[PDB]
Each structure stands twice: as C-alpha cells, then as structure tokens.
C-alpha cells in the first residue's frame, strides 16, 4: 500500500512471575525433602 | 528569504512519566522475587 503521506501484557507478566515463584517454592521443598532423607541414614 | 522587517507536549510528558512508573514497579517486583528465592535456600 501507499506511504501514509498494555493491561493484558502486564497481566501476562504477573502470571509468569507467579509461575516462577511457584516453581521456586517447589524446588525449595524438594531440597528440604532430600536433606531429611540424607539425615535418615 | 527577507528579514521580516503545548497540550500535546504536556500529554507526551505524562505518558513518559507513566512509563517510568511502570518500569519502577516492574523493578521493585523483580527484587521481591529475588528475595523470595534467596530465602528458599
């Protein structure tokens, strides 16, 4: 053709940040379980 | 040639200030996520 002459995004980012936080929590939990097993002998 | 003898700008500035605020909010949020991860072990 001729020469001529945001809220959703922010929300998506918030959802992503949330997911990352959940993943971090899951990881931390996994580490705690491993530590308890190691001390179990 | 011979010797002879504002609203849009303000709006643009407002948009800029807004963007800066959004950036600051994103940064603060990023810092919070980092702090939560550090405490996760």
């Amino acid at each position: 053709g001729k020469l001529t002459n945001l809220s959703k995004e922010l929300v998506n980012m918030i959802v992503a940040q949330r997911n990352y936080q959940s993943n971090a929590q899951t990881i931390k939990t996994q580490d705690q379980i491993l530590n308890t097993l190691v001390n179990l002998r | 040639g011979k010797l002879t003898n504002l609203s849009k700008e303000l709006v643009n500035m407002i948009v800029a200030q807004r963007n800066y605020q959004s950036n600051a909010q994103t940064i603060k949020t990023q810092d919070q996520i980092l702090n939560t991860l550090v405490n996760l072990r």
Binding site: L6, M13, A16, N23, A24 | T26
Partner: peptide, 24 residues
C-alpha cells in the same frame, strides 16, 4: 526433576525479561 524445574524457572525468567524489553 529438580533440574527440570530449575530449567523451567529460567525459561520463565527469560520470557519475563523479553516482555519487559518489549514494553520498554
């Protein structure tokens, strides 16, 4: 499983960074 979770977290962080760059 832990390694996979870490990789997923890294991917999410990268996506967030990309989104921030796009917004900028």
């Amino acid at each position: 499983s832990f390694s996979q979770a870490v990789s997923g977290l890294n991917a999410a962080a990268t996506n967030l960074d990309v989104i921030g760059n796009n917004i900028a």
